[PDB]
Amino acid sequence: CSVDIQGNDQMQFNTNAITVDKSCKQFTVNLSHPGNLPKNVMGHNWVLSTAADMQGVVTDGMASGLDKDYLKPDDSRVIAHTKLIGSGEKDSVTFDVSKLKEGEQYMFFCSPHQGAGMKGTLTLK
Ligand SMILES: [Cu+]
Numbered sequence: 001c002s003v004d005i006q007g008n009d010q011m012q013f014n015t016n017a018i019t020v021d022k023s024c025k026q027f028t029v030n031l032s033h034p035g036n037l038p039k040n041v042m043g044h045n046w047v048l049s050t051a052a053d054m055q056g057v058v059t060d061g062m063a064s065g066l067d068k069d070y071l072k073p074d075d076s077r078v079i080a081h082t083k084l085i086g087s088g089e090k091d092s093v094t095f096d097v098s099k100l101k102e103g104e105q106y107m108f109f110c111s112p113h114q115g116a117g118m119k120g121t122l123t124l125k
Contacts, residue, residue: 002028007044009035009087011113016120018108024097031082032090039086040066044110046082046093048122051105053077054114061111070111079106100124 001024006014020027031046043066049057060072069084080095100106102124109119 001026002030004030004032005046007031007033007046007085007110007113007118009037009042011042011110011116011118013108013110013118013120018120018122020097020100020122020124022097022102022124026094027097028092028094029080029082030090030092031085033085033087035087037087039084039089041086043070043084043086043112044118045069045071045084045112046108047071047111048079048081048095048106048108049077050079051107054107054109054119058109058111058114062115084112097124 003018029046033044057077061070064072079099080093082091082093085091106122107119108122
């Protein structure tokens with residue numbers, strides 16, 4: 001009921017498809033950042049939304065800037081997210097699986113680097 005995900009200095013996650021077992025009450029994402037760049041240069045987060053909401057979350061988040069960890073304050077389209085991290089840092093987020101609809105289309109992504117392709121899928125199986 002948890003996953004360890006890495007974001008690197010090349011704006012890649014080390015996975016692009018998360019499966020959430022239906023037996024899980026909660027799900028945990030453990031985000032880390034290999035490499036050698038600070039958070040104000042090459043910062044990463046982990047953000048969950050529906051596929052439909054992703055573009056708008058990313059656009060509004062980018063425009064909110066670093067100080068706001070590239071997320072629009074109190075964004076209702078964000079199901080779950082970590083904080084923004086630099087190299088050698090880590091952060092975890094846990095959410096209620098009850099917030100997911102089984103078999104539906106969810107995307108995960110880093111908000112400042114989604115446009116560079118830092119994204120993948122998540123499915124309640
Ligand atoms: Cu990123």
